[PDB]
Write a protein that binds this ligand. Sequence first.
Ligand SMILES: COCc1nnc(N)s1
Length: 185
Amino acid sequence: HHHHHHMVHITLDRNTANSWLIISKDRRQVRMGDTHQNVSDNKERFSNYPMVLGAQRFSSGKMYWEVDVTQKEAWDLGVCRDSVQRKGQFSLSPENGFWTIWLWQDSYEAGTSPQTTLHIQVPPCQIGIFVDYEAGVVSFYNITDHGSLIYTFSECVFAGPLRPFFNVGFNYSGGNAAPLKLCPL
Ligand SMILES: COCc1nnc(N)s1
């Protein structure tokens, strides 16, 4: 791919984070804390899952960013509508306003309904996410494997402003404490 030149500087929005997340001072890293992080509750916070949004909102153009997933066992990444549900249980699907992939139990899947099996030969340490708003495209790239394509959502019906979307995953196993990190340009 040749998408690197649409690179954007993404920062995390503390106000949207689940109350157990810890976001770094530079707003570029997030990890699961071992307890409630002593913040007040608000209507923006994801209640049920260890999720957080980027601060940036996109309604046009082409955007590209990269996320470090080194040594994590579980995570979700992609984009979502600014108006996605925050409270209670929900599935990650385009019908619910999410364009995502994930790692779970040693398999990678795209968040279609129902979910789609991904075929990745080289487990990624860094993921590139590309959004073309006008074209209705969200694509994922394996930075560890020379930028190879992972998955493309096409004919996307965004139906609103988009935000970068992150899930650090639970850490029931004691093997998923590592952060998600936004990689430098
Ligand atoms: C000010 O926030 C009001 C709230 N209502 N539901 C929550 N989860 S917190």
